[PDB]
Design a protein around this ligand. Structure first.
Ligand code: SF4
Ligand code: SF4
Ligand code: FES
Ligand SMILES: [Zn+2]
Lengths: 123, 111, 93, 42, 688, 204
């Protein structure tokens, strides 16, 4: 009883001060490190916001920042869910496509070739 | 079948009218009983600038949630809790903001 | 140990002379600057190079008491004495 | 100084200093920043 | 239709015949611990860590070696597989030094992450530990061979992909040293990738050395400038300072490697850069001034002069947001006469049509090529990533590559067809050493370098490529969707300027001298005191000012590639968006904000409020630079070839020789890497 | 073997995974989870009051006590909040979890008539998360300031806040609020490569 179903776009009610409209979100899956050859940081979406101004503090030596919303990393299972959450918050998003590793047929038999020039020299 | 919070579409706007009616009568109570601070006229202008930000009415759920939130942040000063002029001061007076301009913000330091 | 600046304030472990136009010098007006008398750079060369009979020797501070992971150093090179990553101690032969 | 003496290291100070207070020779902070240099010359 | 059904822990998976056990496990989501195997490199069963037991077999086989046949139940979490991984890990760490505090690699280390998860908690080890004498390989790569696990991955990297052949195994058993026996100073292209190839802390960056640990620095994705290919590399920042730049895996940008000149030169942006706006004083020398006062002195001349007597010469480290703003400040306020620093032909519809401006064939499309007929250019000096792609296309598939126009050192074979512009004219007709191979080919491609194009014979080299490409592809060569002609621009901004609508070359400024020139990031020798025969009033706007900065009246500081967040065009024709990693030093501002504030100070104000407003205006001028990381091929190549052939020009007598034709030549170039502590140390040791 | 823990009462406790499920409403049950002698049941938001009247004074399951009323905030799902009612039996000596799901802004049926302790935890969720509860008497801010913006826990906004810095400035009595500058939090990018655990990885 009493449903009152209304279809409309999501809006921010519990929102902070004027900083959401200026800052742009970059919902992109984190790339694997150059040295570490393991895929575990990948296959999970991360919504990291663009970094603002940073300067060395006159108090000591640390680099203090005025920008509050900067040091947060969110997790998402689907690309459609991350895009819907960004619209729900209010901030404009620039989504990047996931770069999947291409399947390359790396066979051991190619190392000892006769006709082909793909023969491995000195082991 | 679906939750409606408090009101459906039209009655939610009348709850805002009910909220504005109650909060307009409470600004003399926040000066004489509480503290003078600024002015009675500027206190009523402080109400208008708060509701002008909420010009984006699109859902009955969003409006009603703001009414329930409004029946706590503005209900705080009716049954007077500990604020003592330091708290319950919505308008920024201590800090001076930089105007939105391509020549003004670039000269000072922004983005 | 370290050379004193023409401005006044003494240099630290690294070459850290404050600029003449820099305002961050008021801090040391009135109250003294804490600079260590013993400089670590000069203390490395002060310690004598020890002689090794065998090819490979293991470096230690003093067992489990003095903090040092057991690192084995190769001593095949004649020129430039072999040193561990932790101490400034050098080894020959 | 009677039964068990501390071992010599030739690095520790011979004379012990008093408490650091509002008096001169008090603690002060500093940074190891070499800073990004700017090049401008006629 | 060539698919085999096999079981990983009892779960069904369909695989192509010829694929390895590890390749089949990647399909379901499993990842077997590895040390030798790499996605780009070849296969070797050295370490024997990727052991995985398949049921009904006496011996455990490696994931590297075995190709998957019909009917295998690969058990990853059996009693023997766990004991195999725990066993070998103890052998790998028995003769490996306790160096984790002094090691340059921290959390990124492959031995650390794997030994904690797969290896045993405690070691049986009592006595041993071998020690290896370290060999000084180069000033760019620090080498501590004590920590090396003799995995044989760098040796394969230098032999198969880099093609230098210096590293090799010497000795037997414990006494095996990886590296060059003759103590040769190893310095070549792609040498800044061998630090990332090595899984352990054996090979590390000497300029970076010790600054931050992998977990401490916050990673940020950006497209690398000052390179033709435009490789993607995640720049790491440790509290408002760029510490290390490491490449990320990408299909379009060659491979999972960055250029040697791009990766090692991280300190170049931090050593010398303009911090405060400098205006020319009454005495003569440039002095630091306020931002409101320095802009007013620049706006006083800019608003006063009108017509064709105002022209901007920009090229080098220029962005797409800078290109859209400078064109809106010049064409709207006065007459448009904006020029590019890099010389490019525009006589026969050069700027018009996207097929002539940029390379038609994709950067990844070099692998699917029958024969590469490259023009007089050095691939080793200009774009090391593209030279690696051409070598990988030569190693994996049989494709004869020909490079005509001055012989140079290359990783591939040879097959040079002389060294003359007349030989290129003969190649268009029925040639004897060439043309016959070009006629009988599946998909031939001709790559024309910008190194020879920026000379006296600009139109002559362009007509030979259009005449040669038009006679080959349209007649019998191309059979469907295939590219014939390609142009790889040396400068980073040259590909972006041609697409936007800038006049290429310094000929526009040479024909009509301007009164006041606002040269945005002037690096190349185009504008000088002798070149401009009037009062200077030159405005220099760009990060790292060493050349061009002394010959300026009012210099305004700008942000580098790591500073400003704006789009950049690739050689293939792809717009890659770069993100801001660190704040600009001093009072320096962004490229899009610098031109908008100049218009606001003057009378005529450009329609721009934010970065989104500048992106919308850039989308209207060119739709190709609107979509990020999406490249589209240009149509009508035969129409462009007919328009270019109408112009008549005589061929030059001098051979088509590249300006950079040395190993030491590609160290200090394009002024951005010239003011560096790392690059100058490398270049001095390259000759000595 | 020394070092791991042994379980034997798992099968005896798994009977409730059938018992409450055999009541069989689409209104209540949905999904039942049981691991390391603890039960997790996730229940549709429309029914919470009729669910908690059950397991209370029932002859077979007599809980009577509510210890925890924790809420899980997770941005991955369309239903953002996973409110967990943790119950404890003193007669049978067993623990059960009554999980629910609520999206961005939808009221759930609050357990004020069922439990007299719930109201204090119900005010805590409305503060930290912003999840409004229907049929609740006197919903007030406890942990937050009397002039606080947003909801303190929500993963949308930073750890440092927005009105963090408070000066005793030029004004004699008024303490400043809207200044947003603070010392930088070193967010360490620590996340180990290679998946350490089998029987957890899902195919795409
Ligand atoms: S390579 Fe890895 S395990 Fe070896 S010392 Fe370095 S950090 Fe430690
Ligand atoms: S130096 Fe590194 S890559 Fe080369 S064999 Fe040793 S461990 Fe492998
Ligand atoms: S990784 Fe397969 S044998 Fe070394
Ligand atoms: Zn030592």
């Amino acid at each position: 009883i009493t449903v009152d179903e209304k279809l409309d776009i999501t809006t921010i009610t519990g929102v902070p001060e004027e900083h959401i409209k200026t800052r742009k979100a970059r919902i992109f899956v984190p790339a694997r490190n150059n040295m570490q050859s393991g895929v575990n940081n990948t296959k999970k979406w991360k919504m990291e916001f663009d970094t603002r101004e940073r300067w060395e503090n006159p108090l000591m030596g640390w680099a203090s920042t005025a920008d509050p919303l900067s040091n947060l990393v969110l997790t998402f299972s689907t690309k459609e869910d991350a895009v819907a959450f960004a619209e729900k918050n209010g901030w404009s998003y620039d989504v990047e496509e996931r770069k999947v590793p291409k399947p390359k047929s790396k066979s051991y038999g190619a190392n000892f070739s006769w006709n082909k020039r793909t023969r491995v020299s000195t082991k | 079948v679906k939750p409606i919070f408090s009101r459906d579409m039209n009655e939610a706007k009348r709850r805002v009218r009910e909220l504005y009616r109650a909060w307009y009568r409470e600004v003399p109570n926040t000066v004489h009983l509480f503290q003078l601070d600024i002015s009675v006229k500027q206190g009523r202008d402080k109400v208008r600038e708060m509701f002008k930000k909420n010009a984006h009415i699109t859902d009955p759920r969003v409006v009603d949630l703001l009414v329930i939130k409004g029946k706590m942040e503005l209900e705080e000063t009716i049954k007077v809790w500990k604020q003592r002029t330091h708290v319950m001061r919505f308008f920024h007076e201590t800090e001076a903001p930089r105007p939105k301009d391509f020549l003004s913000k670039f000269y000072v330091g922004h983005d | 140990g370290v050379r004193t600046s023409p401005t006044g304030e003494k240099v630290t472990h690294t070459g850290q002379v404050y600029d003449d136009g820099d305002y961050r010098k008021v801090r040391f007006v009135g109250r003294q600057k804490e600079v260590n008398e013993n400089f670590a750079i000069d203390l490395i060369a002060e310690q004598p190079v020890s002689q090794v009979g065998s090819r490979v020797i293991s470096c230690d501070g003093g067992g489990g008491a003095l903090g040092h992971p057991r690192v084995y150093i190769n001593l095949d090179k004649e020129t430039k004495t072999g040193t561990c990553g932790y101490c400034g101690l050098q080894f020959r032969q | 100084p009677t039964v068990k003496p501390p071992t010599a290291r030739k690095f520790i100070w011979t004379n012990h200093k008093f408490n650091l207070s509002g008096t001169p020779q008090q603690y002060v902070p500093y940074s190891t920043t070499r800073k990004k240099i700017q090049e401008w010359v006629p | 239709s060539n698919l085999i059904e096999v079981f990983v822990d009892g779960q069904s998976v369909m695989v192509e015949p010829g694929t390895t056990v590890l390749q089949a496990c990647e399909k379901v989501g499993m990842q077997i611990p590895r040390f030798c195997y790499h996605e780009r490199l070849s296969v070797a069963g050295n370490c024997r860590m990727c052991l995985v037991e398949i049921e009904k077999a006496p011996k455990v086989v490696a994931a590297c070696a075995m190709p998957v046949m019909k009917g295998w139940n690969i058990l990853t979490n059996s009693e023997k597989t766990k004991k195999a991984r725990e066993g070998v890990m103890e052998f790998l760490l028995a003769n490996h030094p306790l160096d984790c505090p002094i090691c340059d690699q921290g959390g990124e280390c492959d031995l650390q992450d794997q030994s904690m998860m797969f290896g045993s908690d405690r070691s049986r080890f009592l006595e041993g530990k071998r020690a290896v004498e370290d060999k000084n390989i180069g000033p760019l790569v620090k080498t501590i061979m004590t920590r090396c696990i003799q995995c044989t991955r760098c040796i394969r990297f230098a032999s198969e992909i880099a093609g230098v052949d210096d590293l090799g195994t010497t000795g037997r058993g414990n006494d095996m040293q990886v590296g060059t026996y003759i103590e040769k100073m190893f310095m070549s292209e792609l040498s800044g990738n061998i630090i990332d190839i090595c899984p352990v802390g054996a090979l590390t960056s000497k300029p970076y050395a010790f600054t931050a640990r992998p977990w401490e620095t916050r990673k940020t994705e950006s497209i690398d400038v000052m390179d033709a290919v435009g490789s993607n590399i995640v720049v790491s920042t440790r509290t408002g300072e760029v510490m290390r730049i490491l490449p990320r895996m990408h299909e379009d940008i060659n491979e999972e490697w960055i250029s040697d000149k791009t990766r090692f030169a991280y300190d170049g942006l931090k050593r010398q850069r303009l911090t405060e706006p400098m205006v020319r004083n009454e005495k003569g020398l440039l002095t630091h001034t306020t931002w409101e006062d320095a802009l007013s002195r620049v706006a006083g001349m800019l608003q006063s002069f009108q017509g064709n007597d105002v022209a901007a010469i920009a090229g080098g480290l220029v962005d797409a947001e800078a290109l859209i703003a400078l064109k809106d400040l010049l064409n709207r306020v006065d007459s448009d006469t904006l020029c590019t620093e890099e010389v490019f032909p525009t006589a026969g519809a050069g700027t018009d049509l996207r097929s002539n401006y940029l390379l038609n064939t994709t950067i990844a499309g070099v692998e699917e090529a029958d024969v590469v007929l490259l023009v007089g250019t050095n691939p080793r000096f200009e774009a090391p990533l593209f030279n690696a792609r051409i070598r990988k296309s030569w190693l994996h598939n049989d494709l004869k590559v020909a490079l005509i126009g001055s012989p140079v050192d290359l990783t591939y074979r040879y097959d040079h067809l002389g060294d003359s512009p007349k030989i290129l004219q003969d190649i268009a007709s029925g040639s004897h050493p060439f043309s016959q191979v070009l006629q009988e080919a599946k998909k031939p491609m001709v790559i024309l370098g910008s190194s020879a194009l920026q000379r006296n014979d600009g139109a002559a080299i362009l007509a030979a490529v259009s005449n040669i490409a038009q006679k080959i592809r349209t007649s019998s060569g191309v059979t469907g969707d295939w590219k014939v002609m390609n142009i790889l621009h040396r400068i980073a901004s040259q590909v972006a300027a041609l697409d936007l609508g800038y006049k290429p070359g310094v000929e526009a400024i040479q024909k009509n001298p301007p009164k006041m020139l606002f040269l945005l990031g002037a690096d190349g020798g185009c504008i000088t005191r002798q070149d401009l025969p009037k009062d200077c009033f030159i405005v220099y706007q760009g990060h790292h000012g060493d050349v061009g900065a002394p010959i300026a009246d009012v210099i305004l500081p700008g942000a580098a590639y790591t500073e400003k967040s704006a789009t950049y065009v690739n050689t293939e024709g792809r717009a890659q968006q770069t993100k801001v990693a660190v704040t600009p030093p001093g009072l320096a501002r962004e490229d899009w904000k610098i031109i908008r504030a100049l218009s606001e100070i003057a009378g005529m104000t450009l329609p721009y409020d934010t970065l989104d407003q500048v992106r919308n205006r850039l989308e209207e001028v060119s739709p190709n630079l609107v979509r990020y990381d999406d490249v589209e091929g240009a149509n009508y190549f035969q129409q462009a070839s007919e328009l270019s052939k109408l112009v008549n020009q005589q061929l030059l007598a001098d051979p088509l020789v590249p300006p950079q034709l040395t190993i030491k030549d590609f160290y200090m170039t394009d002024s951005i890497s010239r003011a560096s502590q790392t690059m100058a140390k490398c270049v001095k040791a390259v000759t000595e | 073997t020394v070092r791991p823990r042994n379980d034997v009462a798992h099968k005896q406790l798994s009977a409730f995974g059938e018992y409450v499920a055999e009541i069989l409403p689409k209104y209540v049950q949905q999904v039942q989870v049981s691991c390391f002698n603890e039960l997790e049941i996730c229940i549709h938001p429309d029914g919470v009051i009729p669910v908690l009247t059950f397991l209370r004074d029932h002859s077979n399951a007599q809980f009577k006590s509510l210890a925890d009323l924790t809420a899980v905030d997770i941005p991955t799902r369309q239903n953002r909040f996973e409110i967990v009612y943790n119950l404890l039996s003193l007669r049978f000596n067993s623990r059960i979890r009554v999980k629910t799901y609520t999206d961005e802004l939808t009221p759930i049926e609050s357990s004020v008539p069922v439990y007299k302790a719930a109201n204090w935890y119900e005010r805590e969720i409305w503060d930290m998360f912003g999840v409004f509860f229907a049929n609740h008497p006197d919903l007030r801010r406890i942990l937050t300031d009397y002039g606080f913006e947003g909801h303190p826990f929500r993963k949308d906004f930073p750890l440092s806040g927005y009105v963090e810095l408070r000066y005793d400035d030029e004004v004699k009595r008024v303490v400043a609020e809207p200044v947003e500058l603070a010392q930088e939090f070193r967010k360490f990018d620590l996340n180990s490569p290679w998946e350490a655990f089998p029987a957890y990885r899902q195919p795409p």
